[PDB]
Write a protein that binds this ligand. Structure first.
Ligand SMILES: *[B@]1([O])O[C]([C][N]C2=[C][C]=C(C([N])=[N])[C]=[C]2)[C]C2=[C][C]=[C][C]=C21
Length: 222
């Protein structure tokens, strides 16, 4: 997460840390006591979901860990374009809910216009290093049109754009599948964007969570 600051330890109960081969691969959102939402490109062997995490370097009294029973990738994911970049992870055990582990409600209405949002994660920072402490950034919902010029012919009804004009706060490698929270509701998931990370000109591209209400429910109820 570029041009951000360390998060308030209490402001991210819904945050998931996805691990593979012993290193942080992705982010995720606890959306149900048994389910983590993430990006589909995060499908890597033997995923280990860590909930209630703040510092990845230290062991914490609030941390909980779980293996993945099932990883459900949207049937229409196109890895070349990131179209339908959504995955559902069935936790081995229903997560021990506390004040530091809580599900986050998803924004079902595609109409909703709370441009005032934020990103969070453990992706590579401005110094080029992976932070042990989770990074935050307040950002705004960038226009369909600006994305249509920043990214020529690479935006669909399944993608949302977000960024900050003044500082250029953006998501980066390691933040994949992390939440875009708007009005205390999940609006999107870190999918892709610009290199090097920075939303000055070219914003960050996110998965459009509202487009997947019926898919998520039909996968949770299966
Ligand atoms: B993952 O964490 O990172 C890459 C994609 N990285 C990325 C994310 C956001 C932005 C942005 N907003 N400018 C740019 C680049 C893909 C990936 C693949 C497998 C596992 C994890 C990731």
């Amino acid at each position: 997460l570029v041009h951000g600051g360390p998060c308030d330890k209490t402001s991210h109960p819904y945050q998931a840390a996805l691990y593979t081969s012993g290193h942080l691969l992705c982010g995720g959102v606890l959306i149900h006591p048994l389910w983590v939402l993430t990006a589909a490109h995060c499908k890597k062997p033997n995923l280990q979901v860590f909930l209630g995490k703040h510092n990845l370097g230290q062991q914490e009294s609030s941390q909980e860990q779980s293996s993945v029973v099932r990883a459900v990738i949207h049937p229409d994911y196109d890895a070349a374009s990131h179209d339908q970049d959504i995955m559902l992870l069935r936790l081995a055990r229903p997560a021990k809910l506390s004040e530091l582990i809580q599900p986050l409600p998803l924004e079902r209405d595609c109409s909703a216009q709370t441009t005032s949002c934020h990103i969070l994660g453990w992706g590579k920072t401005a110094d080029g290093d992976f932070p042990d402490t989770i990074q935050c950034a307040y950002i705004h919902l960038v226009s369909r049109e600006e994305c249509e010029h920043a990214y020529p012919g690479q935006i669909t009804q399944n993608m949302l754009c977000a960024g900050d004009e003044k500082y250029g706060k953006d998501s980066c490698q390691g933040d994949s599948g992390g939440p875009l929270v708007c009005g205390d509701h999940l609006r999107g998931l870190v999918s892709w964007g610009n290199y090097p990370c920075g939303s000055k000109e070219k914003p960050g591209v996110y998965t459009n969570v509202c487009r997947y209400t019926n898919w998520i429910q039909k996968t949770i109820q299966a």
